[PDB]
Design a protein around this ligand. Sequence first.
Ligand SMILES: Cc1cc2nc3c(=O)[nH]c(=O)nc-3n(C[C@H](O)[C@H](O)[C@H](O)COP(=O)(O)O)c2cc1C
Ligand SMILES: Cc1cc2nc3c(=O)[nH]c(=O)nc-3n(C[C@H](O)[C@H](O)[C@H](O)COP(=O)(O)O)c2cc1C
Ligand SMILES: Cc1cc2nc3c(=O)[nH]c(=O)nc-3n(C[C@H](O)[C@H](O)[C@H](O)COP(=O)(O)O)c2cc1C
Ligand SMILES: Cc1cc2nc3c(=O)[nH]c(=O)nc-3n(C[C@H](O)[C@H](O)[C@H](O)COP(=O)(O)O)c2cc1C
Lengths: 360, 360, 360, 360
Amino acid sequence: PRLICINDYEQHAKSVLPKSIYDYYRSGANDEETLADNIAAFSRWKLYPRMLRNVAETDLSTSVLGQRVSMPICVGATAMQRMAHVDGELATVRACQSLGTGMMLSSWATSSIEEVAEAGPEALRWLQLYIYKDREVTKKLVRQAEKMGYKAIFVTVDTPYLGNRLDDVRNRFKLPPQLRMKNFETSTLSFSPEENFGDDSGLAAYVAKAIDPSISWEDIKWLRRLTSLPIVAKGILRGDDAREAVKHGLNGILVSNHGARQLDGVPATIDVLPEIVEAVEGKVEVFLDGGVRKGTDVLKALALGAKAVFVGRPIVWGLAFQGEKGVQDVLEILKEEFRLAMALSGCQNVKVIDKTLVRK
Amino acid sequence: PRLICINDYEQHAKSVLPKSIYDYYRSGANDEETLADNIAAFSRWKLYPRMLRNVAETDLSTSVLGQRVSMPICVGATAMQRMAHVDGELATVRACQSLGTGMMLSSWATSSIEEVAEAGPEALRWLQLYIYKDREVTKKLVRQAEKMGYKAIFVTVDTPYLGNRLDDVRNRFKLPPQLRMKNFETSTLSFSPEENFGDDSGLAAYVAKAIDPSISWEDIKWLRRLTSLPIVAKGILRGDDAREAVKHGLNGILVSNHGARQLDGVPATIDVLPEIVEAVEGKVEVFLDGGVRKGTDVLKALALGAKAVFVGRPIVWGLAFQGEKGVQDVLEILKEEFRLAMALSGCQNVKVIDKTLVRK
Amino acid sequence: PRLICINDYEQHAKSVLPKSIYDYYRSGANDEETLADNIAAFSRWKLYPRMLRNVAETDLSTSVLGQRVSMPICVGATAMQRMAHVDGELATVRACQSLGTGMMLSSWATSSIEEVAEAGPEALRWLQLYIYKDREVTKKLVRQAEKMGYKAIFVTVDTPYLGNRLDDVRNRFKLPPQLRMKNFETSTLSFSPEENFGDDSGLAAYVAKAIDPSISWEDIKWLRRLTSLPIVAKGILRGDDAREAVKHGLNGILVSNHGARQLDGVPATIDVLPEIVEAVEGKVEVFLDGGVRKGTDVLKALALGAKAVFVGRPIVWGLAFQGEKGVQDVLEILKEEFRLAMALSGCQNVKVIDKTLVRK
Amino acid sequence: PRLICINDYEQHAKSVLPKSIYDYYRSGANDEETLADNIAAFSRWKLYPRMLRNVAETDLSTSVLGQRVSMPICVGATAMQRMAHVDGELATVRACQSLGTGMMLSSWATSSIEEVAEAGPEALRWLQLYIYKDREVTKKLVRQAEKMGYKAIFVTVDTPYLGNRLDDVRNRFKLPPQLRMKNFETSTLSFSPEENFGDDSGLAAYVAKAIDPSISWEDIKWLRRLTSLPIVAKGILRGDDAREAVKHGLNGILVSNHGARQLDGVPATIDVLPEIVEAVEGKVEVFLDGGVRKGTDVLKALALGAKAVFVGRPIVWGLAFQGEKGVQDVLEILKEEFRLAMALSGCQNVKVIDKTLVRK
Ligand SMILES: Cc1cc2nc3c(=O)[nH]c(=O)nc-3n(C[C@H](O)[C@H](O)[C@H](O)COP(=O)(O)O)c2cc1C
Ligand SMILES: Cc1cc2nc3c(=O)[nH]c(=O)nc-3n(C[C@H](O)[C@H](O)[C@H](O)COP(=O)(O)O)c2cc1C
Ligand SMILES: Cc1cc2nc3c(=O)[nH]c(=O)nc-3n(C[C@H](O)[C@H](O)[C@H](O)COP(=O)(O)O)c2cc1C
Ligand SMILES: Cc1cc2nc3c(=O)[nH]c(=O)nc-3n(C[C@H](O)[C@H](O)[C@H](O)COP(=O)(O)O)c2cc1C
């Protein structure tokens, strides 16, 4: 089928993925108020384009944490990508390498840190880290990322417990039989579908067993001493927490509500972005994810002070359509929509995308 | 059937309850504008969670009027519970005893004050009082509550006449043949379905015959002299009335619109809560009911200054599913959702649930 | 069928009236934005009831222009009532006489001024006047009203031309064959369905032929000199026009958008009421019509400073159900809903219905 | 079929036009947020009519850039009108001549500048100009307009690239075989459907090949030196760009979002109109297009300071119904709705249509 925008990809994915996998990928937490809002909020921000600016030569390039990227549109961590396509994370990293953009690799990937570095050696790669109760497991992940040429750690800070995703509970979500979380060396930590993970969501049970709910700023201190790699706090929604991340010597904030999958009824990320940008006082790069579907979404986040955005679900739908090629298609669609959004708004490059371009 | 959230319970209840009983339980007044709003309003209050607070050990316990409870989630008065399940109020009090939370017993219960105290002797129990034209009836109810170890009187002040519930009028609502309001000793006062209660809603006719529309602050004065038990004004919606309750030596306010069943077009209780908390100046505990369905609802009410919330309809749907076990399930679902909402918002206990957690 | 609220009456009317008649009665102008808003706006005004006020003895009585009425709910002018029921205006006035409220009689009634006075001699009656190009016709109507014991003139000021009601155009609306506008003595002025009234709405053509689009404040001056009866300006939507009516020695303002049938996209009458009440500075009574369907609508208009409200369409639906008895039913439903709305809001009588009862 | 308002015309058009042509005509850009808003925004602006102003003799006449018109309602440029009806632009100009209003002729017309001047010699005619990469092509268009008695140039400034219209991409939109853009003398520039215009929207490819994305204020300078005809900047959405147009010696601004077909998520034109009128300080006439469907839309734009409005899509639907006669019908409907909107709001002529008539 001919798919020409991101929404087309989701629709096709629903038609070809088994229910429990589609549901895992699509779902938000509880009543999914924030899931709807992540998208609605973008529509409330209106664009005020400048005309007659000469946009013959639009340059989409930028940098994330000192590393050059082809566009301010990067791949966010989405667990267990092999459920969507046999090649999962390997397909994803290859598409990123082709595009000249970065991939943030989930700690719960169905491919190892090493496997991913092998498949995309020239690709900009970062590790998304969950703090395990077992700090040696956690340390190993970080050390492996450093060894394998990953350029930053995105530490997820909004997941002391898993959000309650109703469909996952109903479907008793678990990995397909042939698949594992490939970063780990035990049946429990690798999320083996042959393992006892209770009678509800397998993933919620996995988090409860493996992930540390006691995670504090002290643990951020530990992490900051552990690695000299740039560290981004992922999942911040408040200006005071943002300032705290900066105080702790962190190098960035990813304004995120975990794609509306954690606490439901939190605001849309585009709505909190300005408070966070203001709080940080230019001291650290601020990124956004959550509900990015169109070039104009990217334009709005940048106008509001974000350095770059990350996409979660669109990538998984790309994979579901055609693995590597599907992901490349999705990224190219976003790139082209962004170029056009830039051109029609009078922006020659990302440096001239200013706050007067948007109003709520 | 597998029911995993409060809404699931309502759906099942509709499938197993006779129409007139389901309709009695579900209905609001007139066009049901406030009924919709009680729920919608919660969604408008957005959460601003703190991260990295150490939430390994979440403590949900609190106190209501000096009595310890396991969670700030209590059972509100809902008349005639035996329509939902053979055990009605007895099932309810047993579930409350198991949970370590309180039950507010309707004056229009299908089980006596004594029957309920016998079924849940260790349970925290309060009496919801309606002021009868017959003050000796009223006095008896209060004296019985004191004798039978009930810890407070919730005096309902928003029901000089019954609200107009359209479905009840259509169905000519009345008790099933085998059931009575068991606190009373005459055919009229016990709401006998064999009695003449007009051609419209039997309950509206019952109120008109039995309940005193002349109820004033003088009657509050009488009540305050009658018992030394704590007294909570239930059904207050204005700050000036709140201050008046405090002046009268009352010990609490339950901010309530009677589950949107009285005057339609009043605001949602979550929306008026702040005005009431402000009016009371910390002098008396303020509670809320109306539209509480999810853990995040409980979190929002507490963030806005409520000591605890009460649930009406969810309890009746629990009963409809499986009597005592159904009620326990509903309460446990609310408890768990609340725990998770607390954890994900960075709250170790109820004392740290502050106003910065919410914004309208 | 059992009909228990105003909406029930409209539904039944649609089932028993011929399409073109139902459509004439239901329609607003153009896209009907104001028609929807007249109702929606009432829902936006929220009620803040007082408790414990002693409402055993609710007194609904008031006065309109110095004449006592049983409730602040009166019958507004609706043309051609015999289309709805054989007895039309005669049924209506008889119901008003029974209720102890007033009837405002349309200049385009299917019953004469004299016929109506004969059918309801003791009923409070007012004449709604349209200014005809023929001033002798106009004068005759006024003189007849005076002779026949009518107590005021409601001069309609928002109809220099007829609003564009799309359904009427489609149906080529005209009177049924057996009926006339009975105040007039020629084929044209009596709106004979045997007459040439073009190929679009017969009523729009009738207005263009008969009604004076040149109507100015000078004509108000003429009217004010013509009769010593109280005169109310009906159809005012602006405070400046309100002040002008007062300057001209008029005795009242009916805040009206002609039931949303004239200019579409004007605000709801409940929304403009406050500006008008403020403009008038207590110098003249202010009334409202447009979208009144429920007792709480009446309560809100009074809280916002209206002396009384008028109902248009509900009366016609009463007629469609059962002529006189149907109208009486509709009025009694409104009366009872209003009583209950008063009682539940802590109002013993209309004098204590204050502005703190509502907030937008 | 009997069609009595603009919406009726669209509905009929959908029933008789081939899908790809209807879709081309109907579509907005991307998710069509602005397309919906262009219409919704008009409904948010509420009217505050004056009564008793004497509206017997309503005069709709005005002037655009010093040229008298019969009404402040003119025909906006819509490309390729022969797809809608065999006579296309020739039918349109004949209808405009009959109405005494102006036609703005698209540079992408399916009829030549000369053909159109021949068919409507007495009609007020303007040329809508796109700046071609080939400036000699561009110059020729301007010189032809001057020669053929066109009275102004509307330079479109919001189209450095074509907006992304999803349906056009899906349908692979192209001209029907028998048709060309008749102003041009090569296969590419005339948009020959036999030409290679890629695998997506033929029109997007045509723009990319033919239209200059480098267009700047320098090009406006060039245009202003090229012709002494009045020049209007079409597609301005910001006050700062408006001031820049004035500085450049331009004679007008058409506040336009290109009928929501360019950048999606820009505000409705009625919403930005006031900022633009304020920015211009009376120095230049300001016009509006986008979502004009009803007489009250025209009234609102004038109340907010627009000199006249242009209609795009309604004209094409007129054509689809009955070519010249269809266009005349559409224009006459708009004229009559506007007259009535004027009369009912107390406006004798366009000079008295003031800002107090509207409020958002
Ligand atoms: C299927 C799915 C799996 C996810 N897994 C992870 C994960 O493993 N680690 C993590 O930090 N965030 C995870 N997230 C959250 C994303 O990193 C990101 O914040 C979110 O997808 C952004 O919203 P979007 O999906 O609307 O683009 C996941 C999100 C989805 C939708
Ligand atoms: C079926 C039902 C019966 C009720 N009966 C009583 C009652 O007997 N006494 C009383 O004070 N309130 C009564 N109420 C109001 C409740 O105490 C409470 O305010 C309401 O149920 C809270 O809203 P919720 O149902 O959305 O949780 C009743 C409510 C319902 C839904
Ligand atoms: C069927 C119908 C006929 C009407 N005829 C008249 C009329 O003859 N004279 C007049 O001044 N207003 C007329 N009106 C307007 C009413 O007096 C009144 O303003 C309107 O009905 C109030 O809104 P409501 O119908 O929502 O109650 C008419 C309204 C309707 C609905
Ligand atoms: C089918 C169609 C074709 C259009 N072609 C042109 C064009 O050739 N040149 C131009 O400047 N604007 C073009 N526009 C934009 C219009 O001039 C105008 O801004 C728009 O139609 C106004 O919105 P409306 O269609 O809601 O009336 C086109 C619009 C439509 C709907």
